[PDB]
Paper text:
The ESCRT-III-like protein [name] couples filament polymerization with membrane remodeling. It assembles planar sheets as well as 3D rings and helical polymers, all implicated in mitigating plastid-associated membrane stress. Given that two-dimensional (2D) planar sheets share a close geometric relationship with helical lattices, and as a means of understanding the interconnectedness of [name] polymers including rings, spirals and planar sheets, we determined the structure of four [name] helical filaments by cryo-EM.
Specifically, [name]Δα61–219 purified in low-salt conditions (10 mM NaCl), has a greater propensity to form ordered helical filaments and quasi-helical ring stacks than does [name]. The structure of [name]Δα6_L2 was very similar to that of [name]Δα6_L3, although different helical parameters yielded a modified helical lattice with a slight lattice rotation relative to the helical axis. Specifically, the left-handed 21-start helix in [name]Δα6_L2 and [name]Δα6_L3 that runs nearly parallel to the helix axis formed a 19-start helix in Vipp1L1. The CTD modulates [name] polymer stability and dynamism and in its absence, [name] has a higher avidity to form polymers with increased regularity and stability.
Numbering used by the authors:
A (entry chain A), E (entry chain A), F (entry chain A): 1 to 55
B (entry chain A): 164 to 217
C (entry chain A): 110 to 163
D (entry chain A), G (entry chain A): 56 to 109
């Protein structure tokens, strides 16, 4: 495998150290949350619809 | 979403412990515990003295 | 059975609402943590044994 | 002036132990204990400042 | 290394003797302190915020 | 080798006598030290991190 | 000044052996042993500095 899979791993290591290096804990924490409450809307809607059908 | 959440959990805990390492690294960690050991009964001794002062 | 199922559909919703609420509160605390970490790591290197600080 | 501030700190810790005994009589046990924790803190601070004063 | 690293060290020695030579103990002591109490403000603010969240 | 390696050695001798000649013991001593305590910071940081992980 | 720092180190190791005997009386065996390990370390350091002082 070596001649290709090690190329993969080393280029991937460069890119993923770049990515992790370009990460401020505070701002990216601040953006950690906004995303979490996205599938929470669909949950509300589906609960509502099951309710309405049963009603 | 929780993947970022928990990798960030580890992020913050690592930050706290790494910063706190500087304490024991420097030479004042055995002095603070000296003071705490020598004063642990002092607070109770002070309370007892205050009660006896009644 | 319609009612039986809507019941389990309502209980599950309550559970998940609770879970996400607790997640948010813990998140607030651990954002406070990093605020304090900013402070400590940026105000550290103050013992006489080291001068990592400029 | 360093000596003056040490003297003022001793006067203030005297005032605060007197406030602590005042709390011990009418005040709550929890507030009194906190007032005996501030007293010991300021007292150790006064001791350190006297060590410097030497 | 010599041909370049010694150029570096000697030019750096000229510059750092210039810098250290242009340093009066009294005035620069006076300016030693003003700086120290700069990250002390952020410390206050962060303590306050952790307080408020917990409250 | 001669026709090139001796060119190398003689031009290198001119340059390295120039470099060593342009070197005052006192100032360049003064700059000898500032550099030594540079990898000492990273040492502190690494010790701290190993500490924190083990903790 | 090199002599001054050696003298200060001897004074500080005196203080630390006195703290070690203080721990030996009230303090824990483990903390006392660590305080006897710091003492020997600083003492060998003082000996090396005196060797230089010669």
């Amino acid at each position: 495998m070596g001649l290709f899979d090690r190329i993969k791993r080393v280029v991937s290591s460069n890119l993923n150290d770049l990515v992790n290096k370009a990460e401020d804990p505070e701002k990216m924490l601040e953006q950690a949350i906004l995303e979490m409450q996205e599938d929470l809307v669909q949950l509300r809607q589906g609960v509502a619809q099951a309710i309405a059908a049963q009603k | 979403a929780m993947s970022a959440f928990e990798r960030m959990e580890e992020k913050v805990l690592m930050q706290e412990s790494r910063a706190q390492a500087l304490g024991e690294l420097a030479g004042a960690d055995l002095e603070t515990q000296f003071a705490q050991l020598e004063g642990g009964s002092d607070v109770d001794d002070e309370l007892a003295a205050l009660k006896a002062q009644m | 059975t319609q009612s039986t199922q809507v019941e389990t559909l309502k209980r599950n919703l309550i559970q998940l609402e609770s879970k996400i609420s607790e997640a948010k509160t813990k998140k607030e605390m651990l954002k406070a943590r990093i605020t304090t970490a900013k402070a400590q790591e940026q105000l550290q290197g103050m013992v006489r044994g080291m001068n990592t600080s400029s | 002036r360093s000596e003056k501030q040490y003297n003022d700190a001793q006067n203030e810790i005297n005032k605060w132990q007197r406030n602590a005994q005042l709390a011990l009589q009418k005040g709550d046990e929890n507030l009194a204990r906190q007032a005996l924790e501030r007293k010991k803190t300021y007292t150790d601070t006064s001791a350190a400042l006297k060590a410097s004063l030497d």
